[PDB]
């Protein structure tokens, strides 16, 4: 029965639980890598070794945080748990294929582990650009294992996307239109469309790198008439959509959290929120070359990409102001999830704004490949995606588990993490403006003070991660079983109790048309 239940699952809740466990474990791996980065940089000189071992750490840090922590938690975990419940569906459309999307991830992770253990690792950046990633500058199996790791993660997410789109279009109550589904469901559906379209291009690109490395193709090798920049286009055609994939489920959870703890039955401006997510998803496909403003493209192309990138601020700003307008007039419950969501709104805004700085190709010449970029994306990832994850985890942990957290402990955890991430990343703006490059194991002496402070911040965030593990333990250790929650009339996922039975909605909801 244990093997049938946990290895042969066809149940959306159990598969969601597997994803949350997997992503939590991955988050520890990714945290350890981030501390190794910041230990290397925490004083001038060399701690570990040269840039090879250092950038194997950096490369792994990124792949783990993006592919094994954020996407499994948001899409595999919250998505599987919540989407069927929020539409009254009895499971996902392809409940058995869903289980394969999960079980492809431990093999994917194993391949990433193997890449770092064989030879000298893949010290390429998570972008894996040739020729550094090719078979002369990275001879041996490491980069190929990294490519295969991405292939399996890609197949996992493509099949998961097919499952989520089909479920969300086909398995709503017959009276419920698309404009009566909750914003988190919208956010997953749009994320899934972005995955469906972008991951096959990445797959094409890394397959060409594989064949350049092993079958004597020359897609990216000038000696055969190839072009390293073609790889960059193919990678970023996926890689910009990918960052909207990382944030969109977060936006959907933030909408639910802000609505709930404002005591509101609904988010402000529902159709505007749907419009904004669809707009961001669409614009996210036509801006990729803002990752390439120093490669030598023609000036009119740089002007187009500057302009198209900045217009994404418009729909994003509609969401930010609509969250504020959802708070407006609320009976505010200062829960720990609400604290995560408020921190999200402000810190995501700061990071989005430094993204708009970077969108200007002229200024990006000086800022590209510096820590200003690192500061931008850790505000949206370490203080946006992660805050949405933490807010959703503390909000929905009682649903998934049946047990309550200690709210005071969760508030302490939020406070520590807030200090730690801001101490880590805010000084990195100064390091970037003043010219410290990315992917360096050591820096000119002038950069010491802010690197020192940034590394001290990373230890504070480590203390938060450790505290989080204790808090989850304390909840399972004490076994305070949920009785009721507020606002079930507008939060259907709670209405089958905590945790919901293995099978829910065996008798579907009744919704009439009138």
């Amino acid at each position: 029965m244990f093997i049938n239940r946990w290895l042969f699952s066809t149940n959306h809740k159990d598969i969601g639980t597997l994803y949350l466990l997997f992503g939590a474990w991955a988050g520890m791996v990714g945290t350890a890598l981030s501390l190794l980065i910041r230990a290397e940089l925490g004083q001038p000189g060399t701690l570990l070794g040269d840039d090879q071992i250092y950038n194997v750490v950096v490369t792994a840090h990124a792949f783990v945080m993006i592919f094994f922590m954020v996407m499994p938690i948001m899409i595999g975990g919250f998505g599987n748990w919540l989407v069927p419940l929020m539409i009254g569906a009895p499971d996902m459309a392809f409940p058995r294929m869903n289980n394969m999307s999960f079980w492809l991830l431990p093999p994917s992770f194993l391949l990433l582990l193997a890449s770092s253990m064989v030879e000298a690792g893949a010290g390429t950046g998570w972008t894996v650009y040739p020729p550094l990633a090719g078979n002369l500058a990275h001879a041996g199996a490491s980069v190929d294992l990294t490519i295969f790791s991405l292939h399996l993660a890609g197949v996992s997410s493509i099949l998961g996307a097919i499952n989520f789109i089909t479920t969300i279009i086909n398995m709503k109550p017959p009276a419920m239109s698309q404009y009566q589904t909750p914003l988190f469901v919208w956010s997953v559906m749009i994320t899934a469309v972005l995955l469906l379209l972008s991951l096959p291009v990445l797959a094409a690109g890394i397959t060409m790198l594989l064949t350049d490395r092993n079958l004597n193709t020359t897609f990216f090798d000038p000696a055969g008439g190839g072009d390293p920049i073609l790889y960059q286009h193919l990678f970023w055609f996926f890689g910009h959509p990918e960052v909207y994939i990382l944030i969109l489920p977060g936006f959907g959870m933030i909408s639910h959290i802000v609505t709930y703890y404002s005591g509101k039955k609904e988010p402000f401006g529902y159709m505007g929120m749907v419009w904004a997510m669809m707009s961001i998803g669409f614009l996210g496909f036509i801006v990729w070359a803002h990752h390439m403003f120093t490669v030598g493209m023609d000036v009119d192309t740089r002007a187009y990409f500057t302009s198209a990138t900045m217009i994404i601020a418009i729909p994003t700003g509609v969401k930010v102001f609509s969250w504020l307008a959802t708070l407006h007039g609320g009976n505010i419950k200062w829960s720990p999830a609400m604290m995560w969501a408020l921190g999200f709104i402000f810190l995501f805004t700061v990071g989005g704004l430094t993204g708009i700085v970077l969108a200007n190709s002229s200024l990006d010449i000086v800022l590209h490949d510096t820590y200003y970029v690192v500061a931008h994306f850790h505000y949206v990832l370490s203080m946006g995606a992660v805050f949405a994850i933490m807010g959703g985890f503390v909000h929905w942990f009682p649903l998934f588990s049946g047990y309550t957290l200690n709210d005071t402990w969760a508030k302490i955890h939020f406070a520590i993490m807030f200090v730690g991430v801001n101490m880590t990343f805010f000084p990195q703006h100064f390091l970037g403006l003043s010219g410290m490059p990315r992917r360096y194991s050591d820096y000119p002496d002038a950069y010491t003070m802010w690197n020192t402070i940034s590394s001290m911040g990373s230890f504070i965030s480590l203390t938060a991660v450790m505290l989080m593990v204790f808090i989850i333990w304390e909840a399972f250790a004490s076994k305070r079983e949920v009785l009721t929650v507020d606002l079930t009339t507008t939060n259907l996922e709670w209405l089958n109790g905590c945790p919901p039975p293995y099978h829910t909605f065996e008798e579907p909801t009744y919704v009439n048309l009138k």
């Binding site: 295969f148 399996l152 991951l199 690109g205 060409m208």
Partner: protein, 259 residues
């Protein structure tokens, strides 16, 4: 028990065996490329085939033999197959992008021209044109099979499907011959790279699509399809038209315009 129409699937081992088969094929490719051994790769290919065989066998048991494919379930599968074909289109888009990138801006190493110096392309009016008529013809014959099935005509459905499969096999044998006769190779710079990787992934999809049609042929021989309910046949036809359309883009882009 339930009063919805959706399918609650029995707990299954095939997701796990499929995922493990992926691990074995990828680590197996790694062993083959770097440690001169095909062992793991052969295991992985075998377990992958066993997994697909048993998984789709079970989908047949669930639908033809157990009745779980209600119209709502069928509608979901229709969406699923369309979405899968869309992802496959985007996969090929990456290879077309590579082809146009290289051929519209030929670098000095090629001679600054396309085709590169020293490359002698196949004549697109010879076997490539024949291959084009073969796949176009198989799109007509599969449409005849579809209409025969809908009209209840077992004999002509089987005849038309057999013709469709024969043409797919003919394409595959023509392409295998052309690969062998080609005076350029995958190692002949970016010309050979784009030619063989793009037509090679296409040829793989022809083999997949032909295999799918063959599955449909034997299920039709076994009376699985009704005149109204035959989604495996519809999916294999959609996939077949997709394979035909990719070929037409390859033919116009790589064989003809790129010659």
């Amino acid at each position: 028990h339930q009063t919805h129409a959706y399918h609650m699937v029995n707990p299954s081992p095939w997701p796990l065996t499929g995922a493990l088969s992926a691990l074995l094929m990828t680590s197996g490719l790694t062993m083959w490329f770097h440690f001169n051994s095909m062992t793991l790769l052969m295991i992985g290919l075998t377990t992958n085939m066993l997994t697909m065989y048993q998984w789709w066998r079970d989908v047949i048991r669930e639908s033809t033999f157990q009745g779980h494919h209600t119209p709502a379930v069928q509608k979901g599968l229709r969406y699923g197959m369309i979405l899968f074909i869309i992802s496959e289109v985007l996969f090929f888009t990456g290879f077309f992008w590579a082809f146009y990138h290289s051929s519209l801006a030929p670098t000095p190493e090629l001679g600054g021209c396309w085709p590169p110096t020293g490359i002698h392309p196949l004549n697109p009016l010879e076997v490539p044109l024949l291959n084009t008529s073969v796949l176009l013809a198989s799109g007509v014959s599969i449409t005849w099979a579809h209409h025969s099935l809908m009209e209840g005509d077992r004999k002509h459905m089987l005849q038309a499907l057999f013709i469709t499969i024969t043409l797919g096999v003919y394409f595959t044998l023509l392409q295998a011959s052309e690969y062998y006769e080609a005076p350029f190779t995958i190692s002949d710079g970016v010309y050979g790279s784009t030619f063989f990787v793009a037509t090679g992934f296409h040829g793989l999809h022809v083999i997949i699509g032909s295999t799918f049609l063959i599955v449909c042929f034997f299920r039709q021989l076994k009376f699985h399809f009704t005149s109204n309910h035959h989604f495996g046949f519809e999916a294999a036809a959609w996939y077949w038209h997709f394979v035909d359309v990719v070929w037409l883009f390859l033919y116009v882009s790589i064989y003809w315009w790129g010659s």
